[PDB]
Paper text:
Protein splicing is catalyzed by intervening protein sequences termed inteins. The protein-splicing reaction involves the self-removal of the intein and concomitant joining of the two flanking sequences (exteins). All splicing domains found among inteins have the same structural architecture named HINT (Hedgehog/INTein) which relates to the C-terminal domain of the Hedgehog protein (Hh–C or hog domain). Instead of the N-terminal serine or cysteine missing among class 3 inteins, class 3 inteins contain an additional nucleophilic cysteine residue in block F.
We assumed that introducing the unique WCT motif found in class 3 inteins into a class 1 intein together with the first Cys/Ser to Ala mutation could possibly result in a functional cis-splicing intein if they were closely related by a divergently evolved lineage, similar to class 2 and BIL domains. We introduced the WCT motif on the gp41-1 intein based on the amino-acid sequence alignment. However, the engineered class 3 gp41-1 intein (gp41-1_WCT) produced dominantly the C-cleaved product and only a minute amount of the possible splicing product. To better understand the structural basis for non-productive splicing of the engineered class 3 intein, we solved the crystal structure of gp41-1_WCT at 1.85 Å resolution. Unlike in the crystal structures of MchDnaB1_HAA and MchDnaB1_HN, we observed electron density for the N-terminal extein, confirming that gp41-1_WCT is inactive in proteolytic cleavage at the N-terminal junction (N-cleavage). The catalytic triad of Cys124-His65-Thr143 and Trp67 from the WCT motif in the MchDnaB1 intein can be precisely superimposed with the engineered triad of Cys107-His63-Thr123 and Trp65 (0.39 Å for the r.m.s.d. was obtained for the 35 heavy atoms of these four residues excluding Sγ of Cys124), except for the χ1 angle of the nucleophilic Cys107. The presence of the N-extein (see below) likely induced the trans conformation of Cys107 in gp41-1_WCT. Among the three inteins used in the MD simulations, gp41-1_WCT with the N-extein showed the most abundant population for gauche- and the χ1 angle of the introduced Cys107 was much closer to the ideal 180°-trans conformation than to ~200–210° observed in the other simulations for the two MchDnaB1 inteins. The WCT motif engineering on a class 1 intein did not lead to similar rotational dynamics of the active site residues, indicating that additional compensatory mutations are necessary for splicing-active class 3 inteins. A comparison between the splicing active MchDnaB1 intein and the WCT motif-engineered non-splicing gp41-1 intein derived from a class 1 intein implies that accumulation of random mutations in a class 1 intein would not directly lead to a class 3 intein.
Author numbering: -1 to 125
The structure:
Amino acid sequence: GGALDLKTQVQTPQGMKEISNIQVGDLVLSNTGYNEVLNVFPKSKKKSYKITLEDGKEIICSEEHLWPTQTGEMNISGGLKEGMCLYVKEMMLKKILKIEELDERELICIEVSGNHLFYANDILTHN
């Protein structure tokens, strides 16, 4: 799937954890409850972007990383823009204020079960 900055926080039953410390078999919170981490991939340096929401939430992801919106999943390469809304916990729409290009950063991909979604920095994201 996509890739997210190493320090991105995901919600486990035992508390928030940085995604670089997530292991296969961990549980991560989604909009439906907890999905299981089915796989992790090696971190790698990738061109990255920062999405900043109107409520101050920020997430750093790859250009093709998919984000649920009210009109369907979208990524930055496929035309996710400032002025559109993402879902924050719990399923509250929040406007994207800025999308900025952040140069090369270490990003990491995890894959989860179920609806393949999980909250990342409290923003609902796709695998």
